[PDB]
Design a protein around this ligand. Sequence first.
Ligand SMILES: *[C@@H]1O[C@H](CO)[C@@H](O[C@@H]2O[C@H](CO)[C@@H](O[C@@H]3O[C@H](CO[C@H]4O[C@H](CO)[C@@H](O)[C@H](O)[C@@H]4O)[C@@H](O)[C@H](O[C@H]4O[C@H](CO)[C@@H](O)[C@H](O)[C@@H]4O[C@H]4O[C@H](CO)[C@@H](O)[C@H](O)[C@@H]4O)[C@@H]3O)[C@H](O)[C@H]2NC(C)=O)[C@H](O)[C@H]1NC(C)=O
Ligand SMILES: *[C@@H]1O[C@H](CO)[C@@H](O[C@@H]2O[C@H](CO)[C@@H](O[C@@H]3O[C@H](CO[C@H]4O[C@H](CO)[C@@H](O)[C@H](O)[C@@H]4O)[C@@H](O)[C@H](O[C@H]4O[C@H](CO)[C@@H](O)[C@H](O)[C@@H]4O[C@H]4O[C@H](CO)[C@@H](O)[C@H](O)[C@@H]4O)[C@@H]3O)[C@H](O)[C@H]2NC(C)=O)[C@H](O)[C@H]1NC(C)=O
Ligand SMILES: *[C@@H]1O[C@H](CO)[C@@H](O[C@@H]2O[C@H](CO)[C@@H](O[C@@H]3O[C@H](CO[C@H]4O[C@H](CO)[C@@H](O)[C@H](O)[C@@H]4O)[C@@H](O)[C@H](O[C@H]4O[C@H](CO)[C@@H](O)[C@H](O)[C@@H]4O[C@H]4O[C@H](CO)[C@@H](O)[C@H](O)[C@@H]4O)[C@@H]3O)[C@H](O)[C@H]2NC(C)=O)[C@H](O)[C@H]1NC(C)=O
Ligand SMILES: *[C@@H]1O[C@H](CO)[C@@H](O[C@@H]2O[C@H](CO)[C@@H](O[C@@H]3O[C@H](CO)[C@@H](O)[C@H](O)[C@@H]3O)[C@H](O)[C@H]2NC(C)=O)[C@H](O)[C@H]1NC(C)=O
Ligand SMILES: *[C@@H]1O[C@H](CO)[C@@H](O)[C@H](O)[C@H]1NC(C)=O
Ligand SMILES: *[C@@H]1O[C@H](CO)[C@@H](O)[C@H](O)[C@H]1NC(C)=O
Lengths: 461, 461, 461, 125, 125, 125
Amino acid sequence: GNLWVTVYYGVPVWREAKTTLFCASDAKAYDREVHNVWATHACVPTDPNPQEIVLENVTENFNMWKNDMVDQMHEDIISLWDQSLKPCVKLTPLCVTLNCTNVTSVINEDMKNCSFNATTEIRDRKKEMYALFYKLDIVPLDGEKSDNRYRLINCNTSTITQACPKVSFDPIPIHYCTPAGFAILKCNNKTFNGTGPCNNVSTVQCTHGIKPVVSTQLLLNGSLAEEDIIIRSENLTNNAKTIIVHLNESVEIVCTRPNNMTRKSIRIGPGQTFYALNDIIGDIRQAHCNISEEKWNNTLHRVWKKLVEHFPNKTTIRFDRHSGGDLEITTHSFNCGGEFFYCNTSGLFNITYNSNYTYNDTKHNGTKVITLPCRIKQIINMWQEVGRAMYAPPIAGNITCTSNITGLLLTRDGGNNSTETETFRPGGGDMRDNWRSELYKYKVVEIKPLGIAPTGCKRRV
Amino acid sequence: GNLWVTVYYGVPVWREAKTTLFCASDAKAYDREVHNVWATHACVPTDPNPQEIVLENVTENFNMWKNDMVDQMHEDIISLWDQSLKPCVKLTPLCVTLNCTNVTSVINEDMKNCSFNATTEIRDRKKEMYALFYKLDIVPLDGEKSDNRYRLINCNTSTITQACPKVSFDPIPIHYCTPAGFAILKCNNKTFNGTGPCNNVSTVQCTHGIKPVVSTQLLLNGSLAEEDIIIRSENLTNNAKTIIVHLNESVEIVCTRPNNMTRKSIRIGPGQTFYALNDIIGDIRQAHCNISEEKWNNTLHRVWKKLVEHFPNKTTIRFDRHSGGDLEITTHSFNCGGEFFYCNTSGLFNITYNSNYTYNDTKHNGTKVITLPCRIKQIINMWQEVGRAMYAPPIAGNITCTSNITGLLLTRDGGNNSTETETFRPGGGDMRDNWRSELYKYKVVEIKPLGIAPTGCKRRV
Amino acid sequence: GNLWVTVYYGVPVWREAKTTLFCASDAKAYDREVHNVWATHACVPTDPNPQEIVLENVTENFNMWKNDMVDQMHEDIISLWDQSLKPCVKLTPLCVTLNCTNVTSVINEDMKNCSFNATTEIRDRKKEMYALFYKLDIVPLDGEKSDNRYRLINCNTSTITQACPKVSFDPIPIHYCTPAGFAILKCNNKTFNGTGPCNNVSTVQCTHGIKPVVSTQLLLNGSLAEEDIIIRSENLTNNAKTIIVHLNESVEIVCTRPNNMTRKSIRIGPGQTFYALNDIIGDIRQAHCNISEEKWNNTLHRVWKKLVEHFPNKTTIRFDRHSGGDLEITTHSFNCGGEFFYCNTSGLFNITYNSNYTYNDTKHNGTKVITLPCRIKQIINMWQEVGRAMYAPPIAGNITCTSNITGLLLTRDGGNNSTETETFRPGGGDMRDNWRSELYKYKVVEIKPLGIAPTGCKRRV
Amino acid sequence: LGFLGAAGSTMGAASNTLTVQARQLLSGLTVWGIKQLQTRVLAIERYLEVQQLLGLWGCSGKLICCTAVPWNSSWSNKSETEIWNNMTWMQWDREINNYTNTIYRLLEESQFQQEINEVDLLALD
Amino acid sequence: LGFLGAAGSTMGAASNTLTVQARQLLSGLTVWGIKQLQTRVLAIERYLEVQQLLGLWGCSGKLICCTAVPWNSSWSNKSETEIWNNMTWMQWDREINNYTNTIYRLLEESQFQQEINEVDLLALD
Amino acid sequence: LGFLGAAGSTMGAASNTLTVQARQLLSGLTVWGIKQLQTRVLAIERYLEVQQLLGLWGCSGKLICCTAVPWNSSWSNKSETEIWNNMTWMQWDREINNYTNTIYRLLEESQFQQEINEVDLLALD
Ligand SMILES: *[C@@H]1O[C@H](CO)[C@@H](O[C@@H]2O[C@H](CO)[C@@H](O[C@@H]3O[C@H](CO[C@H]4O[C@H](CO)[C@@H](O)[C@H](O)[C@@H]4O)[C@@H](O)[C@H](O[C@H]4O[C@H](CO)[C@@H](O)[C@H](O)[C@@H]4O[C@H]4O[C@H](CO)[C@@H](O)[C@H](O)[C@@H]4O)[C@@H]3O)[C@H](O)[C@H]2NC(C)=O)[C@H](O)[C@H]1NC(C)=O
Ligand SMILES: *[C@@H]1O[C@H](CO)[C@@H](O[C@@H]2O[C@H](CO)[C@@H](O[C@@H]3O[C@H](CO[C@H]4O[C@H](CO)[C@@H](O)[C@H](O)[C@@H]4O)[C@@H](O)[C@H](O[C@H]4O[C@H](CO)[C@@H](O)[C@H](O)[C@@H]4O[C@H]4O[C@H](CO)[C@@H](O)[C@H](O)[C@@H]4O)[C@@H]3O)[C@H](O)[C@H]2NC(C)=O)[C@H](O)[C@H]1NC(C)=O
Ligand SMILES: *[C@@H]1O[C@H](CO)[C@@H](O[C@@H]2O[C@H](CO)[C@@H](O[C@@H]3O[C@H](CO[C@H]4O[C@H](CO)[C@@H](O)[C@H](O)[C@@H]4O)[C@@H](O)[C@H](O[C@H]4O[C@H](CO)[C@@H](O)[C@H](O)[C@@H]4O[C@H]4O[C@H](CO)[C@@H](O)[C@H](O)[C@@H]4O)[C@@H]3O)[C@H](O)[C@H]2NC(C)=O)[C@H](O)[C@H]1NC(C)=O
Ligand SMILES: *[C@@H]1O[C@H](CO)[C@@H](O[C@@H]2O[C@H](CO)[C@@H](O[C@@H]3O[C@H](CO)[C@@H](O)[C@H](O)[C@@H]3O)[C@H](O)[C@H]2NC(C)=O)[C@H](O)[C@H]1NC(C)=O
Ligand SMILES: *[C@@H]1O[C@H](CO)[C@@H](O)[C@H](O)[C@H]1NC(C)=O
Ligand SMILES: *[C@@H]1O[C@H](CO)[C@@H](O)[C@H](O)[C@H]1NC(C)=O
């Protein structure tokens, strides 16, 4: 009948934790290929043959919107961006009066031929150089005369550090690993909607190598769903929360810049030189992206069906374009082949679906695509808290990329009463949501190996 | 009769130590209020309900003048000053010829209206801006003609980094905490004179939250004494040592700048802008401080009585002004509301006390105050080993502060033989003495838990 | 007959290791003498009365060419060089048109009197200053006219940071110490040729205080051999490997700059000033080094005998000058008294030795020396991966140093068939080889204290 | 099974694997080195904390260590079989979370009194 | 009492509180993190040093551990009662400061010989 | 002799000095502090790893600790005298390098089963 306190070490229990994690890049990423923004040599090598241990008979409560790993990843990406932009040449002497004129071929109407005086290797003589600059990067001086005098866009807000000539923007998988005394719980529930209980949860040491793809209104090169479309929102009845639609069938999107462009080195000062656009070889065609019409019809139909399931009694659901603002939020912004693309999405989100039409099966095949026009900037200022922008290096030859859209960053409109209509527009808010599309299953748990259990064993005197 | 060696762990003994300590700011200081010079986010949160454990039946030897915590605090303050002055805009382009004239109202005789050519957002055109600059910050060019051409004072010694537009100089308590294996001993003896034995010493984990107030000749917002005035000196018969008088009744001093001043942003270059004084609204009144005459009479009488006790056979004791030198040492230098004040103290330290007059009780009330004139600088260069000065930001509206003088940094004059007279002048030496006014009771002790004791217990084979 | 597993702690076994080591400067180097390039205050004090424990009855395999300590020392020297060149003034405004003319006395033919416009403390007026610049530091502008317009040599590749006015280049011993759980094995075999077995190996905590002397083609102030000349090469039949000849009798070399030179401060900008050469007092004599002819004859004869031993069937061995390239590799480059010297070595390596002459004993005494001419640069760019050069400070008075050559960095010529001739020229490759002349005996070993041994002792239940 | 593989298992089965969880408790430019360094010394601090707590109970160097402290029925009135047969470690952690500190103090005073009276008795002999 | 609360107390009373002093022995931008990190690993190093010294004496995991080393009268000719009744730990530290290293070596050779001859005797059985 | 002074000596003589090698296992601007800090916490990690491996075998706080695991003849068919008289520690490390992990697992399961059945038997009493 008598019982005594017994101590157990190695007890499998855990609580919540907010510990700092450490990165781990893949071993194949160490085959030289140096000087990429996301290539961090301080990351440890990825653990070979990694283990995921299935934990049966246990249920865990997850919450994507209260995860600290997303915030840690955002901060780590920001400081990596700062470290990569720190060393090379700044374009502060480039903030000078630019004599800009039209670009000789039809008019491009997207670039201007700007000549400027740049100091030579000696800072007492100045040579009149010239370069082709995008119209989104040059603001006209004054604003009341056609004097053809322009300047760089951020010559009055912060400083520009031009991207180093070797740098690359190719994403690589990053395996976030948790320290000793802590583990990562992954929810293997395929139906899981981002929060709540999970009856199939496994413990892992490191994540699945999340690619840090920077994109707005769309999710590029992300992990797909397993069963169906998974709609995730912190609070659906709140219109400020951004819905993260998770597709199960990724759609191929092919983007290109068919123009062939020349690169020329320009000396802006003693020991400071940067690469700039010189000439356009061949005909002039606008850069654009192609998305299959039938596949997008499939995606929009399935998304509307899931949104009808999540929003009862709404007769009509309209997919319209973005409301307004700067170009970085109103357009699909991404990076293809080292070049930053801003693509108009008015042709994609333009439909009205009602519950009284079957809408067929969106069959009858077809090779028709949606040619969404795109524009290119070089003065890139993302994550504006850093205080430092970029001058992206010019790329010779065409650029052509093929990516997969695996999710949409939808956002419901404001309160328009109970008129049985809700208009969902593309979002483009904080970039943290993008990482939240990947860390929707991972939580960090703090191991307590010390346990107390009554047993009829008594220690001797 | 036989005895054996016995080992004890957790033994309460200690020796001297020089270990590195770590800061701890208060939890209420983390309620945003970011971007203050002394607000260090790397400081850990202050431990709630902190304990001070009284150690009875023990006597410890303290020495304020050999403490390493004062040196550590001085170095930490210096590097915090460097880190706060590092990021924002430098005024190196502001080192240009200034066309200075009198300020329109009576003549202010303290500021000059200086116009200068500053580069716009493009570094090819220059606009003629103007600002009001204090005469202590502008040195005239050449020095043999009335050409009205001036320049900034340190355009030929080091660089100036203007204080960032949001920065604040409000001190916050800093709790210096000692690591594991070390403790802090505090001398609770109320009579304690700074060195020697202490029969009531308690062990603590962290200090009392010392405010890092920067001041010369006076001690602002410091801890008071308990019983009487405590005179502290490393060696009284040496005239080079600075006496740190510790008052028991702090005296209220109210300082103000009644002038209302306007702030205007001036662009000095591409991406570089600083705030400068523009205009004076209303009448012109000199900034000054008010100290009650009767309270200062009480303080000077008590200080003279204690100095008579510490210096026998001296018939006359004279309190005179400072000898000479730069303005940073000859005047009471402090910071009120983000503005640096340098106040003449000739009206305070001006008295001759002899032992043959009772000097009454300094009674008969009165509301008479001592109006000590003050001057304001903006090019602040304190702790000159850093190599970087400041341009303090202009403050709109009046500034009015009310502080307490709790101590005097007195300094005896040189050897004038045994003429039965010693003249004590205000000091203003190294700032470390100011921290030594607060760390006069704290010492760092190194715990040895391993102890040896004979006992008749023998370990079995 | 029964046996049981027994665990032993503190087992004296080790394997190979690549752990990071930590520096340790001497205690006498902490007697102020601050602001030297190799004086690192972060180095711990050198351990007093250091121990070297002789390990008998053991043989260890060493390899100088696969050691990681050499790479660690090279990286540490590079980052120390970066840290020392970081703080002080850059000469970017000095990249201006220079009006250069001949230096008044005979013509020096090594320096030019260059006048240039430098901005005063105000960046709106420019004064015409002048200085004496070495012809190796100024490249003429254009290159097709005698316009007497020159510029600094690296005004178009990188930036120059002039060496701080107090800095010194005097090497101090550096004791590389290994952490806990690791040891350093030193091969006491006096005959040891750099790789292979060693039958007398001792364990040590720290190295012998290696001086980081930077030199090409020669080894200055290095440790001597014990028995004879030791020729060390990774692969002798490969002509790309650099032979590190280790002398047993160091030869005294005295180098001097007999010219007396004046130093003048020149203001290049607001808060930026640098020291430059002004005038030459007295007669003009070319800087040169003196090496005793008989001692060099002894060294060359012994080196040829050892190279004959290592290269059989070769009738003739010729010592000729370097092939070609930049001045930093073609000449003996070193630093005497803070001044960088580049000395022509054509007079040293000029001999042909055959096996059919006895060559006497190179006796008959004599005081004849070899006067090898030398040139002096100030724009020093060594270890070009750093991206930052130096402007070495001018030194007033003559400079005279006396060093010891203790080794030669020989290099065999390319494949010229089996013609019974091999020509050995001075090298001057990567600087790591210089450190490999000192870390030829030290290896880092990783201690395993856990051992397993069978014993007939059984633990009780 | 592996690390945490008996978390959903019963108490008796989870007591049979304890070393693989004690393995993980130690395991083992200017900013990321700082972060890895800080989290490594943090994990080392937790391991030293747990080892010190084990040492203060007289259970150093052991995984399962008995203690002569009686089991108070106010902590749990459940008898042994439903604790050890149809219960997990997490549910027991949830029920006995409120009495953890009291149990810890009872263990430390028991061990300290055992050492003190062992010293007192062995000095008599 | 608390940490160091028996420093001025006698030896016998200060032996009764030892765990609260053993608690404190572990406890637990770019520059202040470095300083806190360095002082934490320094304290960890001292704790590991003291624990290793305890382990080499056969006293690991214990606060008061007896040892079969005889007490040399040359270290202290004082008998037990004035050591344990009217004496503090500091005054004993002051008197036996000169013989600390010799006592430490005697403990380590005693423990090492105990292990060696235990191995020698248990291999015979 | 000193640290590693019995590396070339025989097994029996090298077993007589073990504490001086266990001493060295702990020992004890912005970039060099980072390097020293990293290598110190690295050495601390190795010491904690070896101490944890000793603790999992029931050999914590001891230098030479016996174990009831039988010595398999497949690991080494050599009898005791040529192991302990004309052999060094390095040559034994070379011969028994292939069977290190298996021996480690046999020790850990032996210690774990000893703890488990000690708990089972002492609960009966
Ligand atoms: C979502 O995921 C998709 C699928 O992975 C991805 O599309 C792919 O993007 C990559 C990265 O931009 C593209 O690869 C580039 O392709 C060309 C040429 O490479 C071709 O040929 C080589 C040779 O066999 C093949 O290995 C390769 O697969 C291609 O067929 C170049 O633009 C790129 O190479 C340069 O950049 C690399 C940086 O990662 C360097 O490592 C490499 O050495 C090259 O640099 C050198 O060459 C340049 C000129 O050639 C020169 O300017 C440089 O200075 C340097 O000398 C790169 O290999 C790949 O083709 C895409 N795949 C498809 C099907 O389109 C999406 O980008 C991704 N989306 C997002 C938003 O992340
Ligand atoms: C010795 O100790 C004494 C006693 O504490 C101390 O005097 C006090 O100094 C403080 C700090 O300078 C003074 O507080 C300032 O007062 C005014 C206005 O504050 C009044 O109103 C608020 C609102 O209720 C009250 O909380 C407050 O008590 C006052 O009545 C302002 O100048 C200051 O506020 C600005 O500065 C803060 C920085 O600490 C910011 O946190 C705050 O948000 C304010 O900044 C904003 O407003 C500015 C314009 O208003 C604008 O320029 C900024 O950009 C920003 O938008 C501050 O609260 C206090 O009044 C003093 N007390 C007395 C009785 O005089 C001595 O200074 C001290 N001596 C030394 C040498 O350290
Ligand atoms: C291989 O090893 C050899 C042998 O050690 C070495 O030669 C020696 O080099 C050192 C270092 O350059 C030479 O010492 C210099 O000598 C003169 C004057 O010093 C003489 O007088 C003092 C006073 O008694 C003696 O102690 C000394 O031995 C000499 O006789 C000066 O040029 C140097 O002093 C200045 O530099 C030091 C930096 O290390 C400072 O600490 C020192 O305070 C001095 O600086 C001050 O004075 C300068 C003007 O005097 C002024 O410009 C500075 O700003 C500052 O105010 C230094 O002591 C020594 O003479 C050499 N020995 C011989 C026999 O020639 C080789 O250099 C070495 N080779 C290599 C490649 O490393
Ligand atoms: C094997 O290597 C060891 C370690 O280097 C050698 O021992 C060392 O021998 C030298 C002389 O060769 C000793 O230096 C001098 O020795 C004598 C006194 O012994 C005296 O002249 C000097 O006071 C000086 O000490 C040295 O002390 C000694 N030990 C060490 C640790 O360096 C040993 O000789 C080598 N054996 C060979 C080559 O056979
Ligand atoms: C101090 O000594 C007195 C006797 O002189 C004793 O009563 C008291 O308890 C002691 N104080 C402490 C804290 O041990
Ligand atoms: C080396 O071996 C010899 C016998 O060959 C022995 O006498 C000597 O003591 C050994 N040395 C050491 C250090 O054990």
